[PDB]
Design a protein around this ligand. Structure first.
Ligand SMILES: Cn1cc(-c2cncnc2N)c2ccccc21
Length: 330
């Protein structure tokens, strides 16, 4: 729907992202010199309208507490209605971290970039957690670069051109599923590959489910692919057990998802075809490390701690923010 105009000032010029909820488009602002903004145009459908209203209340709250985006939540500039669609105007950001890695052929991010991006992500999400909020849908498509500018450094190992990030500063976007401690918790949150085990087993969740998501995100940034290449719940659990060891017995006894379990163990045949697929694609976590130098070890020590099964034992983002992995940033 390009060349179209919203609120009589925002001319659509391009589509930046598409979603369950609707789309995000790039607009010229005819009333602000023509400089460009992002506009999230939400579907004309209850569940998405309520998510948009909820997102707007969350952002108003965060903009008020942190109007300078010290904690790197995306800045909402205004909102309105148009042919019944909720429209949210945001600062124009660059590419998502997913789209960047994709455009770069699924080459992983350099470890110094991961360091910084992970710090910022943990700072942002901890700010949410300090304000009684759980984001619930952290993933690379929701971490965006402030400006996604690169240079064209040739590398002879890959023997092929690659893109290096001028500046890897990010923002966290998408607060449509963000949930307060006191509000109703959805039964199923997160995108599947970033989804914590307590969510899969329907044990209830809070702030620690976002930490699991972040652990998964950092693994993708480091490898360039997910360690959970699945679309099935029980397999996904089988992949966790292969990467992280058995699930804790008390999580298994607490669950009502009995279909996944036989006696009090995961009902999984390692000799099935799905069993071979898991064994082939997944292996103990630390075996994914590309080097043994201590910086890589500390990343993986943090990763491991983020991917603690028991949400009560999982590391908090407060603790994460002082992890040895982050020192080289001072
Ligand atoms: C490219 N892009 C995507 C989103 C966005 C926001 N909320 C849910 N999903 C999204 N894809 C976004 C927000 C501000 C600026 C640019 C943006």
């Amino acid at each position: 729907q390009s060349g179209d105009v919203l609120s009589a000032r925002y001319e659509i010029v391009d589509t930046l992202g598409e979603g369950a909820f609707g789309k995000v488009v790039e607009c010229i602002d005819h009333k602000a010199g023509g400089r460009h903004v992002a506009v999230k145009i939400v579907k004309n459908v209850d569940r998405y309208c309520e998510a948009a209203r909820s997102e707007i209340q969350v952002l108003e709250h965060l903009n008020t507490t942190d109007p300078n985006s010290t904690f790197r939540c995306v800045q909402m500039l205004e909102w309105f209605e148009h042919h019944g669609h909720i429209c949210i105007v945001f600062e124009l950001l660059g590419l998502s971290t997913y789209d960047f890695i994709k455009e770069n052929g699924f080459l992983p991010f350099r470890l110094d970039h991961i360091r910084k991006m992970a710090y910022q992500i943990c700072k942002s999400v901890n700010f949410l957690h300090s304000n009684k909020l759980t984001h619930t849908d952290l993933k690379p498509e929701n971490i965006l670069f402030v400006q996604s500018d690169y240079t064209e450094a040739y590398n002879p190992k890959i023997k092929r051109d690659e893109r290096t990030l001028i500046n890897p500063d990010i923002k966290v976007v998408d607060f449509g599923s963000a949930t307060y401690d006191d509000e109703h918790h959805s039964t199923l949150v997160s995108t599947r590959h970033y989804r914590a085990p307590e969510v899969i087993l329907a044990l209830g969740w809070s702030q620690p489910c976002d930490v699991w998501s972040i652990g998964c995100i950092l693994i993708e940034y480091y490898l360039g692919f997910t360690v959970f290449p699945t679309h099935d719940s029980k397999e996904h659990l089988a992949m966790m057990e292969r990467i992280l060891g058995p699930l804790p017995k008390h999580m298994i006894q607490k669950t009502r998802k009995r279909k996944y379990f036989h006696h009090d163990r995961l009902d999984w045949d390692e000799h099935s075809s799905a069993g071979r697929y898991v064994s082939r694609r997944c292996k103990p976590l630390k075996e994914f490390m590309l080097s043994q130098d201590v910086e890589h070890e500390r990343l993986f020590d943090l990763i491991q701690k983020m991917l603690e099964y028991d949400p009560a034992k999982r590391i908090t983002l407060r603790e994460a923010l002082k992890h040895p992995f982050f020192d080289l940033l001072k």
